[PDB]
Amino acid sequence: SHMCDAFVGTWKLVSSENFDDYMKEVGVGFATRKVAGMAKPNMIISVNGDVITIKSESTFKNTEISFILGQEFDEVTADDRKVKSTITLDGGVLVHVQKWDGKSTTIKRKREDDKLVVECVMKGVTSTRVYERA
Ligand SMILES: Cc1sc(NC(=O)C2=C(C(=O)O)CCCC2)c(-c2nc(C3CC3)no2)c1C
């Protein structure tokens, strides 16, 4: 058993708060925000040795990242930003920092009761996206 056991599985989005404003702050344009706003992605998390994989599967777009904790990687986001990402575990919370064009956003993923709560922060704007097991 190990580092991210309680994260592993298939998760479905059940609620989203303040996501449009988070997207605005990140720079997403109108049409993408509207289509992104409707999506109910599945989040699929797996671990194989030191490598963690997080897939996002939806109607719009399927994306995937694989990474080692603390080791920077290149990532193309759902809104087509080319970012440099680093994910660490801080007190049981996955902390994902994306850097691009002198900007930064932080996405925190944590287990709370039977949910996986995703908090997305850019400058003063927070969006909370709640997932349940599928
Ligand atoms: C079909 C989907 S899902 C999704 N984003 C998520 O699902 C996101 C999260 C999650 O995994 O819940 C958590 C992190 C933030 C994003 C987008 C989308 N994000 C963006 C900008 C805000 C980054 N632009 O588009 C689309 C088109």
Side-chain angles (χ1 to χ4, degrees):
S1 290
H2 243 270
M3 67 227 198
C4 296
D5 279 357
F7 294 92
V8 166
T10 303
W11 300 91
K12 61 176 178 189
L13 185 68
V14 304
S15 69
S16 181
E17 285 289 357
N18 303 321
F19 188 53
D20 193 57
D21 277 348
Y22 172 79
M23 286 189 289
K24 286 186 175 182
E25 208 79 358
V26 168
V28 184
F30 180 94
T32 301
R33 292 202 312 282
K34 301 294 111 159
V35 160
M38 294 301 303
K40 299 290 178 143
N42 290 153
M43 170 173 46
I44 310 126
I45 302 176
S46 60
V47 179
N48 180 325
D50 290 331
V51 183
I52 305 166
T53 301
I54 302 178
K55 301 185 184 190
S56 180
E57 300 205 341
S58 67
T59 45
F60 183 52
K61 198 86 82 210
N62 301 315
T63 56
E64 168 182 331
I65 62 174
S66 293
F67 60 93
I68 295 172
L69 293 166
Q71 304 195 2
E72 194 168 51
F73 64 96
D74 292 303
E75 178 180 9
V76 180
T77 68
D79 57 313
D80 287 326
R81 289 172 286 125
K82 284 29 108 160
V83 310
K84 293 180 177 297
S85 290
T86 309
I87 304 180
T88 54
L89 277 166
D90 173 15
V93 178
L94 286 167
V95 182
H96 179 178
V97 183
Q98 295 178 334
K99 302 301 194 184
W100 76 104
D101 297 340
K103 302 171 194 175
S104 188
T105 186
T106 297
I107 304 154
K108 292 184 182 174
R109 298 174 176 94
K110 62 195 56 127
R111 275 298 306 273
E112 299 189 18
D113 302 316
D114 289 321
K115 300 166 172 8
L116 195 169
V117 180
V118 183
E119 293 172 355
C120 309
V121 177
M122 170 81 193
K123 290 161 69 204
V125 179
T126 301
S127 174
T128 303
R129 289 168 63 88
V130 178
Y131 291 74
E132 281 176 356
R133 287 202 187 261

Short mmCIF file of all heavy atoms in Angstrom, two decimals, residues 13 19 22-23 26 28 32-33 35-37 39-41 43 54 56-62 77-81 96 98 107 109 118-120 129 131, ligand 1:
data_model
loop_
_atom_site.label_atom_id
_atom_site.label_comp_id
_atom_site.label_asym_id
_atom_site.label_seq_id
_atom_site.Cartn_x
_atom_site.Cartn_y
_atom_site.Cartn_z
N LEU A 13 -17.48 13.77 -11.95
CA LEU A 13 -17.76 15.12 -11.45
C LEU A 13 -19.23 15.22 -11.07
O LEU A 13 -20.06 14.92 -11.92
CB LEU A 13 -17.45 16.17 -12.54
CG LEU A 13 -17.61 17.62 -12.10
CD1 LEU A 13 -16.59 18.02 -11.12
CD2 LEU A 13 -17.54 18.56 -13.32
N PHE A 19 -16.30 27.95 -11.53
CA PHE A 19 -15.38 27.48 -12.57
C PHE A 19 -15.25 28.48 -13.70
O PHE A 19 -14.15 28.62 -14.25
CB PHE A 19 -15.79 26.04 -13.04
CG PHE A 19 -14.83 25.35 -13.95
CD1 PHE A 19 -13.50 25.22 -13.62
CD2 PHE A 19 -15.24 24.82 -15.12
CE1 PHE A 19 -12.63 24.48 -14.40
CE2 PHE A 19 -14.35 24.11 -15.91
CZ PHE A 19 -13.02 23.98 -15.57
N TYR A 22 -12.78 31.01 -12.63
CA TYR A 22 -11.42 30.46 -12.63
C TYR A 22 -10.87 30.42 -14.06
O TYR A 22 -9.74 30.82 -14.33
CB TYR A 22 -11.41 29.07 -11.96
CG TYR A 22 -10.05 28.39 -12.13
CD1 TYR A 22 -9.00 28.72 -11.36
CD2 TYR A 22 -9.90 27.38 -13.05
CE1 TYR A 22 -7.74 28.09 -11.54
CE2 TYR A 22 -8.69 26.73 -13.23
CZ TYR A 22 -7.61 27.11 -12.51
OH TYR A 22 -6.39 26.46 -12.69
N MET A 23 -11.68 29.94 -14.99
CA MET A 23 -11.28 29.89 -16.39
C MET A 23 -10.97 31.27 -16.93
O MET A 23 -10.01 31.44 -17.70
CB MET A 23 -12.33 29.19 -17.23
CG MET A 23 -12.36 27.68 -17.04
SD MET A 23 -13.41 26.81 -18.23
CE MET A 23 -15.04 27.33 -17.62
N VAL A 26 -7.52 32.29 -15.80
CA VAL A 26 -6.51 31.56 -16.49
C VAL A 26 -6.34 32.02 -17.98
O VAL A 26 -5.32 31.74 -18.58
CB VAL A 26 -6.83 30.02 -16.46
CG1 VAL A 26 -5.98 29.26 -17.36
CG2 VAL A 26 -6.73 29.51 -15.04
N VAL A 28 -8.99 31.57 -20.46
CA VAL A 28 -9.75 30.78 -21.41
C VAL A 28 -10.79 31.67 -22.11
O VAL A 28 -11.46 32.47 -21.47
CB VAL A 28 -10.51 29.64 -20.68
CG1 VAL A 28 -11.24 28.72 -21.64
CG2 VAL A 28 -9.52 28.80 -19.87
N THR A 32 -14.64 28.13 -25.42
CA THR A 32 -14.11 27.05 -24.59
C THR A 32 -14.72 27.09 -23.22
O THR A 32 -15.01 26.00 -22.67
CB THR A 32 -12.58 27.08 -24.59
OG1 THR A 32 -12.09 26.94 -25.91
CG2 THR A 32 -12.01 25.99 -23.77
N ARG A 33 -14.86 28.24 -22.59
CA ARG A 33 -15.49 28.26 -21.26
C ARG A 33 -16.87 27.70 -21.27
O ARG A 33 -17.30 26.98 -20.37
CB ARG A 33 -15.56 29.70 -20.70
CG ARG A 33 -14.21 30.33 -20.34
CD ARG A 33 -14.34 31.45 -19.33
NE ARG A 33 -15.40 32.41 -19.68
CZ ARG A 33 -15.29 33.36 -20.59
NH1 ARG A 33 -14.14 33.57 -21.23
NH2 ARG A 33 -16.36 34.15 -20.84
N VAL A 35 -18.25 25.47 -23.37
CA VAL A 35 -18.26 24.01 -23.60
C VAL A 35 -17.66 23.30 -22.39
O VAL A 35 -18.17 22.25 -21.91
CB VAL A 35 -17.51 23.70 -24.88
CG1 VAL A 35 -17.04 22.25 -25.00
CG2 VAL A 35 -18.41 24.18 -26.05
N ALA A 36 -16.60 23.83 -21.85
CA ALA A 36 -15.96 23.27 -20.65
C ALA A 36 -16.90 23.27 -19.46
O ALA A 36 -16.94 22.31 -18.71
CB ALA A 36 -14.71 24.02 -20.30
N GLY A 37 -17.72 24.32 -19.36
CA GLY A 37 -18.66 24.44 -18.28
C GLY A 37 -19.71 23.35 -18.23
O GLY A 37 -20.16 22.97 -17.17
N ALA A 39 -19.25 20.17 -19.29
CA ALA A 39 -18.66 18.82 -19.21
C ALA A 39 -18.79 18.26 -17.79
O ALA A 39 -18.62 18.95 -16.80
CB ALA A 39 -17.24 18.85 -19.63
N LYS A 40 -19.00 16.95 -17.74
CA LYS A 40 -18.96 16.15 -16.50
C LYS A 40 -17.92 15.09 -16.66
O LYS A 40 -18.22 13.93 -16.90
CB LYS A 40 -20.33 15.58 -16.22
CG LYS A 40 -21.44 16.57 -16.01
CD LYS A 40 -21.34 17.35 -14.71
CE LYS A 40 -22.53 18.38 -14.62
NZ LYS A 40 -22.96 18.43 -13.21
N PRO A 41 -16.64 15.46 -16.58
CA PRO A 41 -15.59 14.50 -16.87
C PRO A 41 -15.55 13.37 -15.82
O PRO A 41 -15.94 13.54 -14.67
CB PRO A 41 -14.31 15.31 -16.78
CG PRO A 41 -14.66 16.58 -16.31
CD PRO A 41 -16.08 16.79 -16.27
N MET A 43 -12.58 11.34 -13.92
CA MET A 43 -11.18 11.43 -13.53
C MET A 43 -10.75 10.02 -13.17
O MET A 43 -11.37 9.38 -12.28
CB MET A 43 -11.02 12.41 -12.38
CG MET A 43 -9.64 12.39 -11.77
SD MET A 43 -9.30 13.63 -10.54
CE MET A 43 -10.77 13.55 -9.51
N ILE A 54 -3.12 10.43 -14.16
CA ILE A 54 -4.45 11.06 -13.96
C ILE A 54 -4.99 11.33 -15.34
O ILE A 54 -4.43 12.15 -16.11
CB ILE A 54 -4.35 12.33 -13.16
CG1 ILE A 54 -3.72 12.10 -11.78
CG2 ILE A 54 -5.75 12.90 -13.01
CD1 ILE A 54 -3.55 13.33 -10.94
N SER A 56 -8.41 12.53 -17.64
CA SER A 56 -9.67 13.28 -17.65
C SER A 56 -10.37 12.84 -18.92
O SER A 56 -9.89 13.17 -20.02
CB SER A 56 -9.43 14.77 -17.59
OG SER A 56 -10.67 15.47 -17.59
N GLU A 57 -11.55 12.24 -18.82
CA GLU A 57 -12.29 11.79 -19.98
C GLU A 57 -13.64 12.45 -20.04
O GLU A 57 -14.37 12.47 -19.07
CB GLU A 57 -12.43 10.33 -19.85
CG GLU A 57 -11.03 9.77 -19.81
CD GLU A 57 -10.96 8.39 -20.26
OE1 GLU A 57 -12.05 7.75 -20.25
OE2 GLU A 57 -9.82 7.95 -20.66
N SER A 58 -13.95 13.06 -21.19
CA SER A 58 -15.24 13.76 -21.32
C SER A 58 -15.66 13.72 -22.73
O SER A 58 -14.89 13.27 -23.62
CB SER A 58 -15.19 15.23 -20.86
OG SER A 58 -14.40 15.94 -21.74
N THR A 59 -16.82 14.35 -22.95
CA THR A 59 -17.32 14.63 -24.27
C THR A 59 -16.40 15.51 -25.11
O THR A 59 -16.46 15.50 -26.34
CB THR A 59 -18.71 15.31 -24.15
OG1 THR A 59 -18.66 16.36 -23.13
CG2 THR A 59 -19.70 14.25 -23.77
N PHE A 60 -15.76 16.47 -24.49
CA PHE A 60 -15.11 17.47 -25.31
C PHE A 60 -13.78 16.85 -25.75
O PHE A 60 -13.39 16.79 -26.91
CB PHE A 60 -15.00 18.80 -24.55
CG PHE A 60 -14.39 19.91 -25.36
CD1 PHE A 60 -14.88 20.22 -26.62
CD2 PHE A 60 -13.30 20.62 -24.88
CE1 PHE A 60 -14.31 21.24 -27.37
CE2 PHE A 60 -12.72 21.64 -25.61
CZ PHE A 60 -13.22 21.96 -26.87
N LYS A 61 -13.12 16.30 -24.76
CA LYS A 61 -11.70 16.18 -24.76
C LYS A 61 -11.27 15.08 -23.77
O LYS A 61 -11.79 15.03 -22.66
CB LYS A 61 -11.10 17.52 -24.26
CG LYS A 61 -9.62 17.76 -24.58
CD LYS A 61 -9.44 18.37 -25.97
CE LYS A 61 -9.65 19.87 -25.96
NZ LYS A 61 -10.17 20.39 -27.26
N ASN A 62 -10.42 14.17 -24.19
CA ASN A 62 -9.74 13.23 -23.27
C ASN A 62 -8.31 13.71 -23.13
O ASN A 62 -7.64 13.97 -24.12
CB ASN A 62 -9.79 11.79 -23.78
CG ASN A 62 -11.20 11.30 -23.98
OD1 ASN A 62 -12.07 11.50 -23.16
ND2 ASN A 62 -11.44 10.69 -25.11
N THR A 77 -2.60 21.61 -21.49
CA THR A 77 -3.87 21.63 -20.71
C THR A 77 -5.07 21.50 -21.67
O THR A 77 -4.94 21.61 -22.89
CB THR A 77 -3.91 22.89 -19.83
OG1 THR A 77 -4.04 24.00 -20.71
CG2 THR A 77 -2.78 23.01 -18.92
N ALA A 78 -6.26 21.35 -21.07
CA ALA A 78 -7.48 21.18 -21.84
C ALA A 78 -7.78 22.42 -22.71
O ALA A 78 -8.34 22.30 -23.79
CB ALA A 78 -8.65 20.88 -20.92
N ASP A 79 -7.36 23.59 -22.22
CA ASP A 79 -7.48 24.86 -22.95
C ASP A 79 -6.28 25.21 -23.81
O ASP A 79 -6.12 26.32 -24.26
CB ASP A 79 -7.80 25.99 -21.94
CG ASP A 79 -6.79 26.16 -20.83
OD1 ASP A 79 -6.39 25.16 -20.20
OD2 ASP A 79 -6.43 27.33 -20.54
N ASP A 80 -5.39 24.23 -23.98
CA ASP A 80 -4.25 24.31 -24.92
C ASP A 80 -3.14 25.21 -24.47
O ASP A 80 -2.33 25.65 -25.30
CB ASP A 80 -4.73 24.69 -26.34
CG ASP A 80 -5.43 23.56 -27.01
OD1 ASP A 80 -5.07 22.38 -26.80
OD2 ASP A 80 -6.36 23.81 -27.78
N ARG A 81 -3.03 25.46 -23.17
CA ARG A 81 -1.82 26.07 -22.65
C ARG A 81 -0.70 25.05 -22.64
O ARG A 81 -0.94 23.89 -22.29
CB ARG A 81 -1.99 26.66 -21.26
CG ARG A 81 -2.84 27.90 -21.10
CD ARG A 81 -3.11 28.28 -19.66
NE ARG A 81 -4.11 27.35 -19.07
CZ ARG A 81 -3.97 26.62 -17.98
NH1 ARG A 81 -2.97 26.78 -17.12
NH2 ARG A 81 -4.91 25.72 -17.74
N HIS A 96 -0.57 20.50 -7.41
CA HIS A 96 -0.15 20.56 -8.80
C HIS A 96 -0.01 22.00 -9.18
O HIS A 96 -1.00 22.78 -9.21
CB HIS A 96 -1.27 19.88 -9.60
CG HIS A 96 -1.13 19.82 -11.09
ND1 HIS A 96 -2.08 19.19 -11.84
CD2 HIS A 96 -0.18 20.31 -11.99
CE1 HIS A 96 -1.74 19.26 -13.13
NE2 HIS A 96 -0.59 19.95 -13.24
N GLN A 98 1.14 24.69 -12.14
CA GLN A 98 1.37 24.89 -13.58
C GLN A 98 1.94 26.28 -13.81
O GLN A 98 1.32 27.24 -13.34
CB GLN A 98 0.07 24.80 -14.31
CG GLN A 98 -0.63 23.43 -14.28
CD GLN A 98 -1.94 23.40 -15.00
OE1 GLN A 98 -2.61 24.46 -15.12
NE2 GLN A 98 -2.39 22.23 -15.46
N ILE A 107 -3.55 23.65 -8.39
CA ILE A 107 -4.70 22.73 -8.29
C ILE A 107 -4.36 21.72 -7.20
O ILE A 107 -3.37 21.04 -7.25
CB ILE A 107 -4.88 22.01 -9.62
CG1 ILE A 107 -5.06 22.97 -10.80
CG2 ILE A 107 -6.01 20.99 -9.55
CD1 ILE A 107 -4.64 22.40 -12.11
N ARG A 109 -5.79 18.42 -4.98
CA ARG A 109 -6.71 17.26 -5.02
C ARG A 109 -6.60 16.58 -3.68
O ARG A 109 -5.50 16.23 -3.25
CB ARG A 109 -6.37 16.32 -6.19
CG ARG A 109 -6.51 17.00 -7.57
CD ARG A 109 -6.04 16.12 -8.69
NE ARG A 109 -6.23 16.68 -10.04
CZ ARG A 109 -5.33 17.36 -10.73
NH1 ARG A 109 -4.16 17.68 -10.26
NH2 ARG A 109 -5.64 17.73 -11.98
N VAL A 118 -11.40 18.87 -5.67
CA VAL A 118 -10.37 19.54 -6.49
C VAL A 118 -10.56 21.05 -6.35
O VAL A 118 -11.62 21.58 -6.73
CB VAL A 118 -10.49 19.08 -7.94
CG1 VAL A 118 -9.40 19.70 -8.79
CG2 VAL A 118 -10.50 17.54 -8.04
N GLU A 119 -9.57 21.73 -5.83
CA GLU A 119 -9.58 23.17 -5.65
C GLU A 119 -8.58 23.81 -6.59
O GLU A 119 -7.40 23.43 -6.55
CB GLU A 119 -9.24 23.48 -4.22
CG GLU A 119 -10.29 23.03 -3.22
CD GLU A 119 -9.87 23.16 -1.78
OE1 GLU A 119 -8.70 23.51 -1.49
OE2 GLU A 119 -10.71 22.79 -0.92
N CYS A 120 -9.04 24.74 -7.39
CA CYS A 120 -8.28 25.34 -8.46
C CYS A 120 -8.15 26.81 -8.15
O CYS A 120 -9.16 27.50 -7.98
CB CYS A 120 -9.08 25.17 -9.78
SG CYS A 120 -9.63 23.47 -10.09
N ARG A 129 -14.34 21.76 -7.44
CA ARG A 129 -14.95 20.71 -8.24
C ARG A 129 -14.93 19.42 -7.45
O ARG A 129 -13.87 18.99 -6.98
CB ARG A 129 -14.22 20.56 -9.55
CG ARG A 129 -14.53 21.81 -10.43
CD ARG A 129 -13.71 22.00 -11.62
NE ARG A 129 -13.79 20.98 -12.65
CZ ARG A 129 -14.66 20.95 -13.64
NH1 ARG A 129 -15.72 21.78 -13.68
NH2 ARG A 129 -14.49 20.15 -14.68
N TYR A 131 -15.82 15.43 -6.91
CA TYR A 131 -15.99 14.15 -7.59
C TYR A 131 -16.40 13.08 -6.58
O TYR A 131 -15.99 13.12 -5.40
CB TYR A 131 -14.68 13.69 -8.26
CG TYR A 131 -14.24 14.49 -9.44
CD1 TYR A 131 -13.68 15.78 -9.35
CD2 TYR A 131 -14.39 13.96 -10.71
CE1 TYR A 131 -13.34 16.46 -10.50
CE2 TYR A 131 -14.03 14.65 -11.84
CZ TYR A 131 -13.47 15.89 -11.74
OH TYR A 131 -13.11 16.52 -12.91
C1 LIG B 1 -13.78 18.80 -20.84
C2 LIG B 1 -13.01 19.72 -19.98
S1 LIG B 1 -12.68 19.43 -18.41
C3 LIG B 1 -11.79 20.80 -18.17
N1 LIG B 1 -11.11 21.16 -17.02
C4 LIG B 1 -11.12 20.42 -15.85
O1 LIG B 1 -11.81 19.41 -15.79
C5 LIG B 1 -10.25 20.95 -14.81
C6 LIG B 1 -10.16 20.19 -13.53
C7 LIG B 1 -10.84 18.93 -13.33
O2 LIG B 1 -10.16 17.87 -13.65
O3 LIG B 1 -11.96 18.89 -12.80
C8 LIG B 1 -9.29 20.62 -12.50
C9 LIG B 1 -8.27 21.68 -12.95
C10 LIG B 1 -8.79 22.69 -13.68
C11 LIG B 1 -9.46 22.18 -15.00
C12 LIG B 1 -11.75 21.65 -19.32
C13 LIG B 1 -11.09 22.92 -19.32
N2 LIG B 1 -10.36 23.49 -18.32
C14 LIG B 1 -9.88 24.68 -18.79
C15 LIG B 1 -9.03 25.61 -17.99
C16 LIG B 1 -9.40 25.79 -16.56
C17 LIG B 1 -8.18 25.01 -16.94
N3 LIG B 1 -10.32 24.87 -20.03
O4 LIG B 1 -11.08 23.74 -20.40
C18 LIG B 1 -12.50 20.98 -20.47
C19 LIG B 1 -12.64 21.53 -21.85
#
